[PDB]
From Swiss-Prot, chains A, B:
The gene is Aspa. Zn(2+) binds at residues 17, 20, 112. Its EC number is 3.5.1.15. It holds the Pfam family AstE_AspA_hybrid. It is found in: Cytoplasm; Nucleus. It catalyses: an N-acyl-L-aspartate + H2O = a carboxylate + L-aspartate; N-acetyl-L-aspartate + H2O = L-aspartate + acetate. Catalyzes the deacetylation of N-acetylaspartic acid (NAA) to produce acetate and L-aspartate. NAA occurs in high concentration in brain and its hydrolysis NAA plays a significant part in the maintenance of intact white matter. In other tissues it acts as a scavenger of NAA from body fluids. GO terms for molecular function: aspartoacylase activity; hydrolase activity, acting on carbon-nitrogen (but not peptide) bonds, in linear amides; hydrolase activity, acting on ester bonds; identical protein binding; metal ion binding. PANTHER family: ASPARTOACYLASE. This is Aspartoacylase. Belongs to the AspA/AstE family. Aspartoacylase subfamily. SUPFAM superfamilies: Zn-dependent exopeptidases. CDD domains: M14_ASPA. Its cofactor is Zn(2+).
Amino acid sequence: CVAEEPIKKIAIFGGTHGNELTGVFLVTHWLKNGAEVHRAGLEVKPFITNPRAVEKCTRYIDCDLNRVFDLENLSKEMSEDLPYEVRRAQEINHLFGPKNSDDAYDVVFDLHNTTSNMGCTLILGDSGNDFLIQMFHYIKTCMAPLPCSVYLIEHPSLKYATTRSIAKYPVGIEVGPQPHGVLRADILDQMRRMLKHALDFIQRFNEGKEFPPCAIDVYKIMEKVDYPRNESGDVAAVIHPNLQDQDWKPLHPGDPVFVSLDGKVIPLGGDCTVYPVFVNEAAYYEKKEAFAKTTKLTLNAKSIRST
Amino acid sequence: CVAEEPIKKIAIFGGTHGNELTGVFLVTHWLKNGAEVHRAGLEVKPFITNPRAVEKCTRYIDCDLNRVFDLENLSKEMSEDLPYEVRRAQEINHLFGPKNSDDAYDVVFDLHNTTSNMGCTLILGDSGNDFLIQMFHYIKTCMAPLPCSVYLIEHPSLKYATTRSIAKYPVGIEVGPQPHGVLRADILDQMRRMLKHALDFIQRFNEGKEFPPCAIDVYKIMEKVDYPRNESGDVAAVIHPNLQDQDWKPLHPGDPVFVSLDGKVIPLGGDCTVYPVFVNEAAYYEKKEAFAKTTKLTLNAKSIRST
Ligand SMILES: [Zn+2]
Ligand SMILES: [Zn+2]
Protein backbone atom coordinates (compact mmCIF):
# COMPACT_ATOMS: atom_id res chain seq x y z
CA CYS A 1 0.00 0.00 0.00
CA VAL A 2 1.48 3.32 -1.19
CA ALA A 3 0.86 6.61 0.61
CA GLU A 4 1.57 9.95 -1.10
CA GLU A 5 0.99 13.53 0.05
CA PRO A 6 -1.83 15.68 -1.47
CA ILE A 7 -1.08 17.08 -4.94
CA LYS A 8 -1.00 20.88 -4.80
CA LYS A 9 0.49 22.41 -7.94
CA ILE A 10 -0.90 21.55 -11.40
CA ALA A 11 0.28 22.98 -14.72
CA ILE A 12 -1.59 22.25 -17.97
CA PHE A 13 0.67 22.99 -20.93
CA GLY A 14 -0.65 23.74 -24.41
CA GLY A 15 1.21 24.82 -27.53
CA THR A 16 4.56 23.06 -26.97
CA HIS A 17 4.18 22.49 -30.74
CA GLY A 18 2.23 25.52 -31.93
CA ASN A 19 0.51 23.77 -34.81
CA GLU A 20 -1.25 21.11 -32.67
CA LEU A 21 -4.30 23.32 -32.18
CA THR A 22 -6.39 21.49 -29.58
CA GLY A 23 -3.94 22.05 -26.73
CA VAL A 24 -3.69 25.69 -27.84
CA PHE A 25 -7.44 26.25 -27.97
CA LEU A 26 -8.14 24.93 -24.46
CA VAL A 27 -5.32 26.78 -22.71
CA THR A 28 -6.41 29.96 -24.46
CA HIS A 29 -9.95 29.41 -23.22
CA TRP A 30 -9.13 28.25 -19.66
CA LEU A 31 -6.68 31.06 -19.03
CA LYS A 32 -9.57 33.36 -20.03
CA ASN A 33 -12.18 31.52 -17.94
CA GLY A 34 -10.81 28.86 -15.62
CA ALA A 35 -13.99 27.31 -14.25
CA GLU A 36 -13.71 24.11 -16.29
CA VAL A 37 -10.33 23.24 -14.78
CA HIS A 38 -11.09 24.60 -11.35
CA ARG A 39 -10.93 22.05 -8.49
CA ALA A 40 -10.97 22.97 -4.78
CA GLY A 41 -7.54 22.84 -3.20
CA LEU A 42 -5.70 22.75 -6.50
CA GLU A 43 -3.94 25.66 -8.20
CA VAL A 44 -4.50 24.27 -11.69
CA LYS A 45 -2.37 26.47 -13.95
CA PRO A 46 -2.95 26.48 -17.76
CA PHE A 47 0.07 27.91 -19.63
CA ILE A 48 1.34 28.20 -23.25
CA THR A 49 4.83 26.93 -23.99
CA ASN A 50 5.52 28.38 -27.40
CA PRO A 51 3.61 31.59 -28.21
CA ARG A 52 5.94 32.26 -31.15
CA ALA A 53 5.28 28.81 -32.66
CA VAL A 54 1.55 29.11 -31.93
CA GLU A 55 1.36 32.73 -33.07
CA LYS A 56 2.61 31.56 -36.50
CA CYS A 57 0.88 28.14 -36.27
CA THR A 58 4.09 26.22 -36.77
CA ARG A 59 5.58 23.21 -34.94
CA TYR A 60 8.83 24.81 -33.69
CA ILE A 61 11.33 27.65 -34.31
CA ASP A 62 14.85 26.20 -34.17
CA CYS A 63 14.43 22.75 -32.64
CA ASP A 64 11.76 20.49 -31.14
CA LEU A 65 10.80 21.96 -27.76
CA ASN A 66 10.08 18.42 -26.55
CA ARG A 67 13.68 17.20 -26.98
CA VAL A 68 15.70 19.72 -24.97
CA PHE A 69 14.66 19.15 -21.37
CA ASP A 70 17.69 17.07 -20.58
CA LEU A 71 19.71 18.69 -17.79
CA GLU A 72 22.44 18.86 -20.42
CA ASN A 73 20.70 21.71 -22.28
CA LEU A 74 19.03 23.11 -19.16
CA SER A 75 22.38 23.95 -17.57
CA LYS A 76 23.77 25.51 -20.75
CA GLU A 77 25.25 29.01 -20.49
CA MET A 78 23.22 31.79 -22.09
CA SER A 79 24.36 33.38 -25.36
CA GLU A 80 23.12 34.85 -28.65
CA ASP A 81 23.51 31.79 -30.90
CA LEU A 82 21.20 30.04 -28.40
CA PRO A 83 18.15 28.25 -29.91
CA TYR A 84 14.84 29.98 -29.18
CA GLU A 85 13.31 26.79 -27.81
CA VAL A 86 16.30 26.63 -25.44
CA ARG A 87 15.81 30.24 -24.34
CA ARG A 88 12.25 29.10 -23.62
CA ALA A 89 13.01 25.69 -22.07
CA GLN A 90 15.37 27.20 -19.51
CA GLU A 91 12.60 29.59 -18.52
CA ILE A 92 10.15 26.70 -18.25
CA ASN A 93 12.48 24.58 -16.16
CA HIS A 94 12.75 27.64 -13.92
CA LEU A 95 9.04 28.43 -13.62
CA PHE A 96 7.82 24.84 -13.32
CA GLY A 97 10.84 22.99 -12.02
CA PRO A 98 13.78 22.77 -11.62
CA LYS A 99 13.83 19.30 -13.20
CA ASN A 100 13.95 16.71 -10.41
CA SER A 101 13.68 18.91 -7.33
CA ASP A 102 11.40 19.25 -4.31
CA ASP A 103 10.45 22.62 -5.85
CA ALA A 104 9.41 20.91 -9.12
CA TYR A 105 5.76 21.28 -10.04
CA ASP A 106 3.69 18.36 -8.84
CA VAL A 107 1.89 17.55 -12.10
CA VAL A 108 2.28 18.69 -15.68
CA PHE A 109 -0.27 17.58 -18.31
CA ASP A 110 1.39 18.41 -21.67
CA LEU A 111 -1.20 18.41 -24.46
CA HIS A 112 -0.37 17.13 -27.95
CA ASN A 113 -2.17 16.18 -31.17
CA THR A 114 -1.39 13.54 -33.80
CA THR A 115 -2.40 13.07 -37.44
CA SER A 116 -2.41 9.25 -36.85
CA ASN A 117 -5.61 7.25 -36.05
CA MET A 118 -4.72 6.72 -32.39
CA GLY A 119 -7.81 7.88 -30.53
CA CYS A 120 -7.73 8.90 -26.84
CA THR A 121 -4.16 8.20 -25.65
CA LEU A 122 -2.26 8.62 -22.34
CA ILE A 123 1.53 8.61 -21.87
CA LEU A 124 3.29 7.17 -18.83
CA GLY A 125 6.98 7.85 -18.23
CA ASP A 126 7.43 5.25 -15.46
CA SER A 127 5.90 1.78 -15.09
CA GLY A 128 6.77 2.04 -11.42
CA ASN A 129 4.58 5.09 -10.81
CA ASP A 130 1.62 3.76 -8.83
CA PHE A 131 -0.02 7.20 -8.56
CA LEU A 132 -0.10 7.57 -12.36
CA ILE A 133 -1.22 4.00 -13.00
CA GLN A 134 -4.19 4.65 -10.68
CA MET A 135 -4.98 7.98 -12.41
CA PHE A 136 -4.85 6.25 -15.81
CA HIS A 137 -6.98 3.31 -14.67
CA TYR A 138 -9.46 5.86 -13.25
CA ILE A 139 -9.57 7.72 -16.58
CA LYS A 140 -10.06 4.61 -18.71
CA THR A 141 -12.78 3.36 -16.37
CA CYS A 142 -14.62 6.67 -16.34
CA MET A 143 -14.44 7.17 -20.08
CA ALA A 144 -15.58 3.62 -20.85
CA PRO A 145 -16.60 2.47 -23.35
CA LEU A 146 -14.68 5.24 -25.17
CA PRO A 147 -11.09 3.82 -25.37
CA CYS A 148 -8.18 5.75 -23.78
CA SER A 149 -4.99 3.83 -24.70
CA VAL A 150 -1.82 3.87 -22.64
CA TYR A 151 1.56 4.24 -24.35
CA LEU A 152 4.42 3.17 -22.03
CA ILE A 153 7.70 4.80 -23.08
CA GLU A 154 10.17 4.15 -20.29
CA HIS A 155 13.53 2.42 -20.84
CA PRO A 156 15.95 5.10 -19.45
CA SER A 157 18.15 4.69 -22.54
CA LEU A 158 15.62 6.80 -24.42
CA LYS A 159 13.49 8.46 -21.74
CA TYR A 160 14.99 11.68 -20.40
CA ALA A 161 14.00 14.83 -22.28
CA THR A 162 10.57 16.48 -22.36
CA THR A 163 8.73 19.61 -21.25
CA ARG A 164 6.63 17.58 -18.81
CA SER A 165 9.60 15.57 -17.47
CA ILE A 166 10.28 18.23 -14.84
CA ALA A 167 6.95 17.36 -13.23
CA LYS A 168 7.06 15.44 -10.00
CA TYR A 169 4.15 13.79 -11.85
CA PRO A 170 4.36 14.24 -15.65
CA VAL A 171 1.53 13.10 -17.95
CA GLY A 172 1.31 13.16 -21.70
CA ILE A 173 -2.21 13.61 -23.13
CA GLU A 174 -2.07 12.87 -26.85
CA VAL A 175 -5.16 13.44 -28.98
CA GLY A 176 -5.62 12.63 -32.64
CA PRO A 177 -6.04 11.98 -35.42
CA GLN A 178 -6.13 15.66 -36.45
CA PRO A 179 -4.33 17.45 -39.31
CA HIS A 180 -1.89 19.89 -37.70
CA GLY A 181 -3.21 23.45 -37.99
CA VAL A 182 -6.84 22.22 -37.81
CA LEU A 183 -9.46 22.35 -35.01
CA ARG A 184 -12.00 19.46 -34.87
CA ALA A 185 -14.72 19.98 -32.25
CA ASP A 186 -14.76 16.25 -31.55
CA ILE A 187 -11.04 16.14 -30.67
CA LEU A 188 -11.42 19.24 -28.48
CA ASP A 189 -14.26 17.58 -26.55
CA GLN A 190 -12.20 14.41 -26.04
CA MET A 191 -9.06 16.21 -24.84
CA ARG A 192 -11.33 18.10 -22.39
CA ARG A 193 -12.98 14.93 -21.08
CA MET A 194 -9.60 13.32 -20.49
CA LEU A 195 -8.51 16.35 -18.50
CA LYS A 196 -11.86 16.47 -16.72
CA HIS A 197 -11.44 12.95 -15.36
CA ALA A 198 -7.76 13.51 -14.48
CA LEU A 199 -8.14 16.76 -12.53
CA ASP A 200 -11.12 15.17 -10.73
CA PHE A 201 -8.87 12.23 -9.84
CA ILE A 202 -6.43 14.58 -8.14
CA GLN A 203 -9.12 16.24 -6.03
CA ARG A 204 -10.56 12.82 -5.12
CA PHE A 205 -7.21 11.20 -4.30
CA ASN A 206 -7.03 14.12 -1.90
CA GLU A 207 -10.52 13.83 -0.42
CA GLY A 208 -9.53 10.38 0.78
CA LYS A 209 -11.42 8.25 -1.71
CA GLU A 210 -8.51 5.84 -1.29
CA PHE A 211 -8.20 3.69 -4.40
CA PRO A 212 -8.22 -0.14 -4.52
CA PRO A 213 -5.29 -2.11 -6.06
CA CYS A 214 -5.39 -2.51 -9.87
CA ALA A 215 -3.51 -2.82 -13.15
CA ILE A 216 -3.83 -1.41 -16.66
CA ASP A 217 -3.14 -2.65 -20.16
CA VAL A 218 -0.36 -0.60 -21.77
CA TYR A 219 1.65 -0.47 -24.96
CA LYS A 220 5.43 -0.49 -24.34
CA ILE A 221 7.75 1.09 -26.86
CA MET A 222 10.08 -1.42 -28.52
CA GLU A 223 11.64 0.53 -31.41
CA LYS A 224 10.91 3.06 -34.19
CA VAL A 225 10.64 1.87 -37.80
CA ASP A 226 11.84 4.34 -40.41
CA TYR A 227 10.66 4.69 -43.98
CA PRO A 228 12.72 2.74 -46.49
CA ARG A 229 14.43 5.58 -48.34
CA ASN A 230 16.26 5.85 -51.65
CA GLU A 231 20.05 6.22 -51.69
CA SER A 232 18.99 9.85 -52.09
CA GLY A 233 17.15 10.61 -48.87
CA ASP A 234 13.44 10.75 -49.75
CA VAL A 235 11.17 7.76 -49.07
CA ALA A 236 10.52 5.09 -51.74
CA ALA A 237 7.13 3.75 -50.59
CA VAL A 238 3.90 4.65 -48.75
CA ILE A 239 2.07 3.22 -45.74
CA HIS A 240 0.01 0.29 -46.99
CA PRO A 241 -3.77 0.93 -47.07
CA ASN A 242 -4.51 -1.99 -44.76
CA LEU A 243 -2.10 -0.56 -42.18
CA GLN A 244 -3.23 3.05 -42.71
CA ASP A 245 -5.25 4.23 -39.66
CA GLN A 246 -4.73 0.87 -37.86
CA ASP A 247 -2.88 2.06 -34.75
CA TRP A 248 -2.98 -0.46 -31.84
CA LYS A 249 -4.11 -3.50 -33.90
CA PRO A 250 -1.69 -6.49 -33.83
CA LEU A 251 0.50 -6.94 -36.91
CA HIS A 252 1.81 -10.28 -38.13
CA PRO A 253 5.14 -10.98 -39.94
CA GLY A 254 3.36 -11.44 -43.28
CA ASP A 255 1.00 -8.45 -43.07
CA PRO A 256 1.56 -5.59 -45.55
CA VAL A 257 3.12 -2.45 -44.02
CA PHE A 258 4.58 -0.34 -46.89
CA VAL A 259 3.92 -0.19 -50.64
CA SER A 260 5.83 1.53 -53.45
CA LEU A 261 4.29 3.49 -56.29
CA ASP A 262 5.31 0.55 -58.47
CA GLY A 263 2.96 -1.44 -56.26
CA LYS A 264 5.46 -3.78 -54.52
CA VAL A 265 4.27 -4.72 -51.01
CA ILE A 266 6.71 -4.91 -48.10
CA PRO A 267 5.41 -7.10 -45.24
CA LEU A 268 6.15 -6.71 -41.54
CA GLY A 269 8.70 -9.50 -41.38
CA GLY A 270 10.28 -10.63 -38.12
CA ASP A 271 8.93 -13.48 -35.99
CA CYS A 272 6.60 -11.67 -33.62
CA THR A 273 3.21 -9.98 -33.75
CA VAL A 274 3.58 -6.32 -32.67
CA TYR A 275 1.25 -3.35 -32.12
CA PRO A 276 1.77 -0.29 -34.33
CA VAL A 277 1.44 3.22 -32.96
CA PHE A 278 2.00 6.73 -34.36
CA VAL A 279 1.39 5.28 -37.82
CA ASN A 280 2.11 7.85 -40.52
CA GLU A 281 2.53 10.90 -38.22
CA ALA A 282 3.49 14.03 -40.18
CA ALA A 283 6.01 15.36 -37.64
CA TYR A 284 7.88 12.07 -37.70
CA TYR A 285 8.85 11.99 -41.38
CA GLU A 286 12.02 13.83 -40.33
CA LYS A 287 12.55 11.89 -37.08
CA LYS A 288 12.58 8.78 -39.27
CA GLU A 289 9.58 6.96 -37.80
CA ALA A 290 6.91 5.54 -40.16
CA PHE A 291 5.48 4.02 -36.94
CA ALA A 292 6.69 2.78 -33.54
CA LYS A 293 6.71 -0.89 -32.56
CA THR A 294 5.40 -1.56 -29.06
CA THR A 295 4.67 -4.61 -26.93
CA LYS A 296 1.36 -5.13 -25.11
CA LEU A 297 1.46 -6.05 -21.40
CA THR A 298 -0.08 -5.41 -17.97
CA LEU A 299 1.05 -2.99 -15.24
CA ASN A 300 -0.15 -3.53 -11.68
CA ALA A 301 -0.50 -0.71 -9.15
CA LYS A 302 -0.55 -1.02 -5.38
CA SER A 303 -3.64 0.41 -3.67
CA ILE A 304 -3.03 4.12 -2.94
CA ARG A 305 -4.36 6.96 -0.77
CA SER A 306 -3.32 10.40 0.45
CA THR A 307 -1.43 10.86 3.74
CA CYS B 1 -19.86 20.22 -83.48
CA VAL B 2 -17.15 22.25 -81.73
CA ALA B 3 -13.82 21.94 -83.56
CA GLU B 4 -10.48 22.04 -81.74
CA GLU B 5 -6.70 22.22 -82.17
CA PRO B 6 -4.78 19.02 -81.28
CA ILE B 7 -3.46 19.52 -77.74
CA LYS B 8 0.26 18.73 -77.49
CA LYS B 9 2.17 20.54 -74.72
CA ILE B 10 0.94 19.37 -71.35
CA ALA B 11 2.55 19.96 -67.94
CA ILE B 12 1.86 18.26 -64.59
CA PHE B 13 2.58 20.64 -61.70
CA GLY B 14 3.14 19.12 -58.27
CA GLY B 15 4.24 21.03 -55.17
CA THR B 16 2.77 24.53 -55.63
CA HIS B 17 2.29 24.50 -51.87
CA GLY B 18 5.27 22.57 -50.52
CA ASN B 19 3.45 20.37 -48.01
CA GLU B 20 0.70 18.95 -50.27
CA LEU B 21 2.47 15.61 -50.47
CA THR B 22 0.65 13.60 -53.14
CA GLY B 23 1.68 15.84 -56.01
CA VAL B 24 5.19 16.24 -54.64
CA PHE B 25 5.44 12.43 -54.78
CA LEU B 26 3.64 11.52 -58.02
CA VAL B 27 5.45 14.15 -60.09
CA THR B 28 8.78 13.05 -58.58
CA HIS B 29 7.89 9.49 -59.54
CA TRP B 30 6.60 10.53 -63.00
CA LEU B 31 9.78 12.46 -63.78
CA LYS B 32 11.76 9.19 -63.65
CA ASN B 33 8.91 6.75 -64.28
CA GLY B 34 6.97 8.47 -67.04
CA ALA B 35 5.07 5.55 -68.58
CA GLU B 36 1.90 6.03 -66.54
CA VAL B 37 1.58 9.59 -67.91
CA HIS B 38 3.05 8.74 -71.33
CA ARG B 39 0.53 9.12 -74.16
CA ALA B 40 2.09 8.49 -77.57
CA GLY B 41 2.31 11.91 -79.25
CA LEU B 42 2.31 14.11 -76.15
CA GLU B 43 5.37 15.72 -74.58
CA VAL B 44 3.65 15.34 -71.17
CA LYS B 45 6.00 17.04 -68.72
CA PRO B 46 5.75 16.56 -64.92
CA PHE B 47 7.20 19.54 -62.98
CA ILE B 48 7.72 20.57 -59.31
CA THR B 49 6.66 24.21 -58.92
CA ASN B 50 7.97 25.25 -55.48
CA PRO B 51 11.06 23.08 -54.78
CA ARG B 52 12.38 25.30 -51.96
CA ALA B 53 9.05 25.06 -50.09
CA VAL B 54 9.01 21.30 -50.84
CA GLU B 55 12.48 20.91 -49.31
CA LYS B 56 11.16 22.53 -46.11
CA CYS B 57 7.78 20.73 -46.34
CA THR B 58 6.08 24.09 -45.94
CA ARG B 59 3.21 25.69 -47.87
CA TYR B 60 5.28 28.66 -49.06
CA ILE B 61 8.51 30.52 -48.25
CA ASP B 62 7.27 34.15 -48.47
CA CYS B 63 3.80 34.30 -50.03
CA ASP B 64 1.33 31.92 -51.70
CA LEU B 65 2.85 30.77 -55.05
CA ASN B 66 -0.65 29.89 -56.32
CA ARG B 67 -1.81 33.52 -55.95
CA VAL B 68 0.93 35.47 -57.76
CA PHE B 69 0.48 34.64 -61.42
CA ASP B 70 -1.42 37.84 -62.24
CA LEU B 71 0.01 40.08 -64.99
CA GLU B 72 1.35 42.67 -62.56
CA ASN B 73 3.47 40.01 -60.86
CA LEU B 74 4.66 38.21 -64.01
CA SER B 75 6.11 41.40 -65.52
CA LYS B 76 7.09 42.94 -62.15
CA GLU B 77 10.67 44.15 -61.74
CA MET B 78 12.62 42.50 -58.92
CA SER B 79 13.02 44.40 -55.62
CA GLU B 80 14.79 43.55 -52.35
CA ASP B 81 11.61 43.08 -50.32
CA LEU B 82 9.66 41.33 -53.06
CA PRO B 83 8.41 37.83 -52.09
CA TYR B 84 10.49 34.92 -53.44
CA GLU B 85 7.39 33.27 -54.94
CA VAL B 86 6.96 36.26 -57.29
CA ARG B 87 10.43 35.57 -58.72
CA ARG B 88 9.67 31.81 -58.93
CA ALA B 89 6.44 32.57 -60.79
CA GLN B 90 8.34 34.40 -63.56
CA GLU B 91 10.63 31.37 -63.95
CA ILE B 92 7.68 28.92 -64.15
CA ASN B 93 6.18 31.19 -66.81
CA HIS B 94 9.52 31.64 -68.64
CA LEU B 95 9.43 27.85 -69.03
CA PHE B 96 5.71 26.99 -69.51
CA GLY B 97 4.11 30.07 -71.10
CA PRO B 98 4.25 32.97 -71.91
CA LYS B 99 0.95 33.21 -70.08
CA ASN B 100 -1.67 34.55 -72.54
CA SER B 101 0.37 33.77 -75.66
CA ASP B 102 0.28 31.33 -78.57
CA ASP B 103 3.39 29.77 -77.02
CA ALA B 104 1.58 28.87 -73.79
CA TYR B 105 1.66 25.24 -72.71
CA ASP B 106 -1.57 23.56 -73.87
CA VAL B 107 -2.58 21.67 -70.73
CA VAL B 108 -1.05 22.12 -67.31
CA PHE B 109 -2.42 20.08 -64.42
CA ASP B 110 -1.72 21.57 -60.96
CA LEU B 111 -1.96 19.00 -58.18
CA HIS B 112 -3.30 19.86 -54.72
CA ASN B 113 -4.34 18.18 -51.45
CA THR B 114 -6.85 19.51 -48.93
CA THR B 115 -7.13 18.64 -45.24
CA SER B 116 -10.90 18.99 -45.96
CA ASN B 117 -13.01 15.85 -46.72
CA MET B 118 -14.34 16.83 -50.17
CA GLY B 119 -13.17 13.70 -52.01
CA CYS B 120 -11.85 13.99 -55.56
CA THR B 121 -12.37 17.50 -56.94
CA LEU B 122 -11.75 18.97 -60.42
CA ILE B 123 -11.42 22.78 -60.59
CA LEU B 124 -12.95 24.47 -63.63
CA GLY B 125 -12.01 28.03 -64.56
CA ASP B 126 -14.12 28.50 -67.71
CA SER B 127 -17.83 27.79 -67.40
CA GLY B 128 -18.09 27.85 -71.19
CA ASN B 129 -15.08 25.72 -72.14
CA ASP B 130 -16.51 22.70 -73.97
CA PHE B 131 -13.10 21.04 -74.14
CA LEU B 132 -12.65 21.00 -70.35
CA ILE B 133 -16.28 20.19 -69.68
CA GLN B 134 -15.77 17.11 -71.86
CA MET B 135 -12.53 16.12 -70.15
CA PHE B 136 -14.20 16.42 -66.74
CA HIS B 137 -17.19 14.32 -67.86
CA TYR B 138 -14.73 11.71 -69.16
CA ILE B 139 -12.82 11.58 -65.88
CA LYS B 140 -16.03 11.43 -63.77
CA THR B 141 -17.28 8.46 -65.82
CA CYS B 142 -13.99 6.62 -65.51
CA MET B 143 -13.90 7.16 -61.73
CA ALA B 144 -17.54 6.23 -60.98
CA PRO B 145 -18.79 5.14 -58.48
CA LEU B 146 -16.12 7.19 -56.70
CA PRO B 147 -17.37 10.73 -56.18
CA CYS B 148 -15.71 13.35 -58.37
CA SER B 149 -17.32 16.77 -57.88
CA VAL B 150 -16.63 19.96 -59.78
CA TYR B 151 -15.70 23.28 -58.22
CA LEU B 152 -16.28 26.03 -60.79
CA ILE B 153 -14.69 29.48 -60.33
CA GLU B 154 -16.43 32.50 -61.91
CA HIS B 155 -14.91 35.52 -60.10
CA PRO B 156 -11.71 36.60 -61.96
CA SER B 157 -9.95 37.48 -58.71
CA LEU B 158 -9.65 34.00 -57.21
CA LYS B 159 -8.54 32.48 -60.47
CA TYR B 160 -6.47 34.78 -62.67
CA ALA B 161 -3.46 34.73 -60.33
CA THR B 162 -3.30 30.91 -60.10
CA THR B 163 -0.28 28.82 -61.08
CA ARG B 164 -2.34 26.79 -63.56
CA SER B 165 -3.48 29.97 -65.32
CA ILE B 166 -0.33 30.09 -67.44
CA ALA B 167 -1.36 27.27 -69.84
CA LYS B 168 -3.84 27.35 -72.72
CA TYR B 169 -6.04 24.87 -70.77
CA PRO B 170 -5.68 25.12 -66.97
CA VAL B 171 -6.76 22.17 -64.80
CA GLY B 172 -6.73 22.06 -61.00
CA ILE B 173 -6.65 18.60 -59.43
CA GLU B 174 -7.61 18.49 -55.75
CA VAL B 175 -7.73 15.41 -53.48
CA GLY B 176 -8.65 15.34 -49.81
CA PRO B 177 -8.88 14.67 -46.96
CA GLN B 178 -5.16 14.43 -46.24
CA PRO B 179 -3.26 16.12 -43.40
CA HIS B 180 -0.44 18.18 -44.87
CA GLY B 181 3.05 16.80 -44.32
CA VAL B 182 1.59 13.29 -44.75
CA LEU B 183 1.47 10.75 -47.63
CA ARG B 184 -1.59 8.42 -47.60
CA ALA B 185 -1.56 5.49 -50.03
CA ASP B 186 -5.27 5.71 -50.90
CA ILE B 187 -4.99 9.41 -51.76
CA LEU B 188 -1.93 8.75 -53.97
CA ASP B 189 -3.81 6.06 -55.84
CA GLN B 190 -6.82 8.30 -56.35
CA MET B 191 -5.19 11.42 -57.80
CA ARG B 192 -3.09 9.23 -60.11
CA ARG B 193 -6.25 7.58 -61.49
CA MET B 194 -8.06 10.85 -62.21
CA LEU B 195 -4.90 11.85 -64.10
CA LYS B 196 -4.49 8.62 -66.01
CA HIS B 197 -7.96 9.27 -67.40
CA ALA B 198 -7.29 12.97 -68.04
CA LEU B 199 -4.31 11.97 -70.18
CA ASP B 200 -6.18 9.17 -71.98
CA PHE B 201 -8.88 11.71 -72.89
CA ILE B 202 -6.26 13.99 -74.39
CA GLN B 203 -4.60 11.30 -76.50
CA ARG B 204 -7.95 9.98 -77.76
CA PHE B 205 -9.23 13.50 -78.41
CA ASN B 206 -6.17 14.14 -80.55
CA GLU B 207 -6.63 10.85 -82.39
CA GLY B 208 -9.84 12.36 -83.73
CA LYS B 209 -12.24 10.67 -81.32
CA GLU B 210 -15.39 12.74 -81.77
CA PHE B 211 -17.07 13.31 -78.38
CA PRO B 212 -20.85 13.77 -78.35
CA PRO B 213 -22.52 16.53 -76.30
CA CYS B 214 -22.65 16.01 -72.52
CA ALA B 215 -23.50 17.63 -69.17
CA ILE B 216 -22.06 17.63 -65.63
CA ASP B 217 -23.00 18.84 -62.14
CA VAL B 218 -20.89 21.75 -60.84
CA TYR B 219 -20.63 23.81 -57.64
CA LYS B 220 -19.90 27.47 -58.26
CA ILE B 221 -18.34 29.42 -55.46
CA MET B 222 -20.63 32.07 -53.95
CA GLU B 223 -18.87 33.45 -50.88
CA LYS B 224 -16.44 32.52 -48.10
CA VAL B 225 -17.57 32.15 -44.49
CA ASP B 226 -14.99 33.03 -41.85
CA TYR B 227 -14.84 31.59 -38.34
CA PRO B 228 -16.43 33.90 -35.71
CA ARG B 229 -13.45 35.80 -34.24
CA ASN B 230 -13.48 37.58 -30.89
CA GLU B 231 -12.20 41.18 -30.78
CA SER B 232 -8.60 40.09 -30.25
CA GLY B 233 -8.89 38.42 -33.65
CA ASP B 234 -8.76 34.89 -32.25
CA VAL B 235 -11.11 32.08 -33.27
CA ALA B 236 -14.32 32.26 -31.19
CA ALA B 237 -15.97 29.07 -32.50
CA VAL B 238 -15.02 25.97 -34.47
CA ILE B 239 -16.62 23.89 -37.22
CA HIS B 240 -19.65 22.06 -35.79
CA PRO B 241 -19.30 18.26 -35.71
CA ASN B 242 -22.33 17.98 -38.02
CA LEU B 243 -20.64 20.23 -40.61
CA GLN B 244 -17.11 18.89 -40.05
CA ASP B 245 -16.08 16.47 -42.85
CA GLN B 246 -19.39 17.10 -44.59
CA ASP B 247 -18.27 18.88 -47.73
CA TRP B 248 -20.66 19.12 -50.71
CA LYS B 249 -23.43 18.04 -48.32
CA PRO B 250 -26.23 20.66 -48.78
CA LEU B 251 -26.89 22.83 -45.75
CA HIS B 252 -30.21 24.26 -44.74
CA PRO B 253 -31.14 27.51 -42.87
CA GLY B 254 -31.17 25.50 -39.65
CA ASP B 255 -28.12 23.16 -39.61
CA PRO B 256 -25.61 24.55 -37.06
CA VAL B 257 -22.48 26.12 -38.54
CA PHE B 258 -20.10 26.87 -35.67
CA VAL B 259 -19.82 25.80 -32.06
CA SER B 260 -17.93 27.58 -29.31
CA LEU B 261 -16.34 25.85 -26.33
CA ASP B 262 -19.20 26.89 -24.05
CA GLY B 263 -21.57 25.04 -26.33
CA LYS B 264 -22.99 28.02 -28.30
CA VAL B 265 -24.54 27.26 -31.70
CA ILE B 266 -24.37 29.45 -34.80
CA PRO B 267 -26.43 27.78 -37.56
CA LEU B 268 -26.46 29.01 -41.14
CA GLY B 269 -29.96 30.43 -41.03
CA GLY B 270 -29.49 32.91 -43.87
CA ASP B 271 -32.07 32.68 -46.63
CA CYS B 272 -31.47 29.51 -48.65
CA THR B 273 -29.65 26.26 -49.33
CA VAL B 274 -25.89 26.13 -49.87
CA TYR B 275 -23.13 23.59 -50.55
CA PRO B 276 -20.25 24.17 -48.07
CA VAL B 277 -16.81 23.58 -49.59
CA PHE B 278 -13.31 23.59 -48.03
CA VAL B 279 -14.96 22.95 -44.71
CA ASN B 280 -12.12 23.25 -42.24
CA GLU B 281 -9.15 23.29 -44.67
CA ALA B 282 -5.69 23.72 -43.06
CA ALA B 283 -4.20 26.31 -45.39
CA TYR B 284 -7.28 28.56 -45.14
CA TYR B 285 -7.76 29.85 -41.57
CA GLU B 286 -5.40 32.63 -42.67
CA LYS B 287 -7.55 33.47 -45.69
CA LYS B 288 -10.35 33.74 -43.10
CA GLU B 289 -12.40 30.97 -44.74
CA ALA B 290 -13.80 28.34 -42.36
CA PHE B 291 -15.47 27.03 -45.55
CA ALA B 292 -16.74 28.58 -48.78
CA LYS B 293 -20.40 28.48 -49.83
CA THR B 294 -21.18 27.48 -53.44
CA THR B 295 -24.27 27.21 -55.71
CA LYS B 296 -25.18 24.05 -57.63
CA LEU B 297 -25.73 23.91 -61.38
CA THR B 298 -25.22 21.82 -64.50
CA LEU B 299 -23.06 22.69 -67.51
CA ASN B 300 -23.84 21.26 -70.95
CA ALA B 301 -21.04 20.81 -73.49
CA LYS B 302 -21.58 20.52 -77.25
CA SER B 303 -19.94 17.73 -79.22
CA ILE B 304 -16.22 18.18 -79.88
CA ARG B 305 -13.48 16.78 -82.10
CA SER B 306 -9.93 17.63 -83.14
CA THR B 307 -9.39 19.44 -86.43
ZN1 LIG C 1 3.92 17.04 -31.12
ZN1 LIG D 1 -4.37 24.16 -52.40
